[model samples]
Target: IVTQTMKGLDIQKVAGTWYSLAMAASDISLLDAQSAPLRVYVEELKPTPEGDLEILLQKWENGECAQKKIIAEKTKIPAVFKIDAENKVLVLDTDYKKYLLFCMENSQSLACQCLVRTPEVDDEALEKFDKALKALPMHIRLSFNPTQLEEQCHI
Candidate 1:
């Protein structure tokens, strides 16, 4: 139940929008059409009055925008959340307005993604992301390719 999380994370500050720049599922096969295009969508995070959080994902699918909602419960640990009793979600890093790094530690595997406030990326941010990713365990490090996603990536 213990994990390293962003300190002094103003829930209000984090609430707003984020775009999934890149993501790597522990199971690469999951990155098919339904998932791969997730990078092109915009995600919304809203805080609830009870200190809980609600998530909304808006994406273009089947030629139109589609939406999905996820409800997350509050935890004693700040910046750490759980969708249910079994799923643990953690925010590893974020610059509030620039980018957010998140990780999910599931029962059998792990998944992570980098979210940028904007849909586009600048060289400086990408460079910092490259260095940060290198510090992660090799298996969980993400292969970023927002442009050439069809390109294969190895674990």
Candidate 2:
């Protein structure tokens, strides 16, 4: 399969916080264990003095609001390096307000994560998401996890 990067991707514009609307992974526990909606923070986007972006991702873990920080390097392609080929993230679509991220490895398509700025997603956003999902051959299931913003994972 041929993977193409989104054109005219401005890493600066993609910076900020995003709420995970839905996601799927090989380890269903990681996705199913979450009672709180996962939140992702693209806190830092810096240039490595060679045009590569140093990215910081803070993804919520569980109900305790436990979190982990994973630093990634985004090079010419919209991908996170150093991880295994399957774990590499690809920016399928994004416009700051919403994002569609996908990846594939070992000849299997990994889970696709969809995020939005607003907790309440409208029809237009759903339409846009479908359009982006069409880019991939497989269809991924999207599930919503409730979250408590005040240091609690779930309300």
Candidate 3:
């Protein structure tokens, strides 16, 4: 594949443990218990091997955040991030962590969220990414499917 030699952005957002901001979040946890407060949780990335990232998430329950290790089924790719311009696909992969995979639709996700195109929004950081793309040379500009391609942006 002809690789484009240019600046690229990590499709996956990265930051401290992010809150699980989704409408379904409530439904799954405290939908009927709306009066009860619920918090979103994600683990911080800890390096395992050279240039690798790992994090876990737990839905607060039964006292502490239920370790996903006991529950989160492994299927989707881990939420990792790297800019592979040649392939023109933002890459997010986590082979290290088992029993866990990013809920994000993409292989790589903007560190903050699982997917660039997912209807779910975290609001704050996503706004930042929205601006960051303008200053950056991501191929989002040259796309046929804004809804499909742009949100899953690759640098």
**lDDT: which candidate is best?**
1
Provide TM-scores for the models.
0.71, 0.62, 0.29
RMSD of each: 5.6, 4.7, 14.6
Off by over 4 Å in 1: 1-4, 32-42, 58-65, 135-155
Quantify all predictions' global Cα lDDT against the true fold.
0.62, 0.49, 0.29
Q: 1-155, model 1: which lDDT tens digit per residue?
A: 22446887776677887766666554554454543532334367888877787887665456555677878788887788888757777777788888877766667455566777764654665665555555554242333445533222211
Which portions of model 3 miss their true places by more than 4 Å? 1-17, 21-40, 60-64, 69-103, 106-155
lDDT of 3: 0.29
Residue 117 in candidate 3, Cα distance off native in Å: 21
lDDT of 2: 0.49
> Which digits, one per residue and each the tens of the lDDT, describe model 3 over residues 1-155?
11211133222334233333221221223322313222223444443333344445445455553544211222233322332321112222221212112222222221212222222333553443344343332221111222322221111
Q: What is candidate 2's lDDT per residue for 1-155, written digit by digit as tens?
A: 42655676665676556655555444343344444232343333444544454555455554344445554455556444334323465666666655545443345535556566656544565675566556555433554543432223323
lDDT of 3 at 40: 27
Once model 2 is optimally superposed onto the true structure by TM-score, how far is the C-alpha of residue 126 displaced, in angstroms?
Answer: 2.5
